[PDB]
Amino acid sequence: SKPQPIAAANSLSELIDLFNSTSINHDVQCVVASTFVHLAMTKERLSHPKFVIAAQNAGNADALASLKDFGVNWIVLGHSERRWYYGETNEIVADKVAAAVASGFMVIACIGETLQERESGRTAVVVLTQIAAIAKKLKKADWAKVVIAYEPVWAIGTGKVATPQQAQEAHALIRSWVSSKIGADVAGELRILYGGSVNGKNARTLYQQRDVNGFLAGLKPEFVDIIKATQ
Numbered sequence: 001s002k003p004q005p006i007a008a009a010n011s012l013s014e015l016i017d018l019f020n021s022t023s024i025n026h027d028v029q030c031v032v033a034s035t036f037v038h039l040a041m042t043k044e045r046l047s048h049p050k051f052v053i054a055a056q057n058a059g060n061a062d063a064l065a066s067l068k069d070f071g072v073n074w075i076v077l078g079h080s081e082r083r084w085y086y087g088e089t090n091e092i093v094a095d096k097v098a099a100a101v102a103s104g105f106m107v108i109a110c111i112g113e114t115l116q117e118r119e120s121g122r123t124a125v126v127v128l129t130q131i132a133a134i135a136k137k138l139k140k141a142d143w144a145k146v147v148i149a150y151e152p153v154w155a156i157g158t159g160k161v162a163t164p165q166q167a168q169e170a171h172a173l174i175r176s177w178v179s180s181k182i183g184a185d186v187a188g189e190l191r192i193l194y195g196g197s198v199n200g201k202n203a204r205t206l207y208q209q210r211d212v213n214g215f216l217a218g219l220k221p222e223f224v225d226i227i228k229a230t231q
């Protein structure tokens with residue numbers, strides 16, 4: 001059976017109110033990730049015990065230490081625009097992941113191919129090269145602290161979701177590599193989340209696929225339906 005699912009979100013006061021009042025009637029880890037400036041309020045306000053707060057993109061020893069001290073134990077790293085806009089390479093992302101794990105963080109590590117990479121049939125090579133870089137900086141025990149988020153760059157914010165077949169093919173390819181390079185025990189416990197134009201309507205169908213363990217989506221009222229779709 002699948003490991004514990006995750007639903008992560010990547011008028012905020014009304015939004016925190018809505019989440020706080022939501023009964024979630026199954027086992028799922030919910031995560032709200034936000035920029036430094038909003039962390040303090042999110043932690044002050046978000047009290048639902050099935051939710052944790054996550055930082056994003058911290059890459060400095062002292063910054064990570066400060067976050068942990070403040071009670072932040074999760075972090076999202078390597079998200080799409082980090083790579084295609086800011087210029088974080090596969091190795092920079094991998095180093096940030098290694099540092100975070102070393103500082104005691106649960107890490108949602110993001111990987112995914114661009115439109116051209118997809119169209120030219122290079123999804124597998126790109127995505128696997130990205131995760132291999134991450135794996136290079138980790139030891140086996142570290143994977144207990146890692147969560148993989150697969151997001152086709154062409155599906156992020158474009159309104160174009162991957163089909164269930166596309167998502168499943170990508171997740172299975174990732175899990176098979178983890179199984180063979182890291183170990184089948186690690187593969188079986190690893191959460192691989194899908195992200196990119198997930199909504200209330202399409203999430204539950206995606207979750208039905210063998211290798212989908214949850215979602216990364218925007219912080220919006222419909223995230224509640226995304227949480228419900230994780231079963």
Ligand SMILES: O=C(O)CCS(=O)(=O)O
Pocket residue numbers: 010151155156157158195196197198216217218
């Ligand atoms: O933040 C992401 O990872 C996904 C945002 S969206 O594609 O659902 O609009």
